[PDB]
DNA sequence: GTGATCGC
DNA sequence: GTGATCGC
């Protein structure tokens, strides 16, 4: 399931950016709220990482 | 510990 | 096979 809107991050070189996360998804225990994780690429680095979306990222 | 995901 | 992602 991949993003469509921009999320506002902080990415692992520092700096805020502006990025379409390439696959998101909820990360939640049964019973407990949890939070929306997205897979992101850095264009500067090239690097993955990971970042929490807002609570009402659509999944 | 829990939850899912995947580049490394 | 799992680090790292978060809030509970």
Known sequence: ?????????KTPAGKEAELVPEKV???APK??????IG????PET????????????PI
């Open 39 to 42: 897979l992101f690429k850095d």
């Open 25 to 27: 998804w909820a990360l």
């Open 31 to 36: 019973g407990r709220k949890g939070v929306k």
């Open 46 to 57: 090239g690097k993955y990482f990971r970042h929490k979306l807002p609570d009402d990222y």
């Open 1 to 9: 399931s991949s993003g469509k809107k921009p999320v506002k991050v």
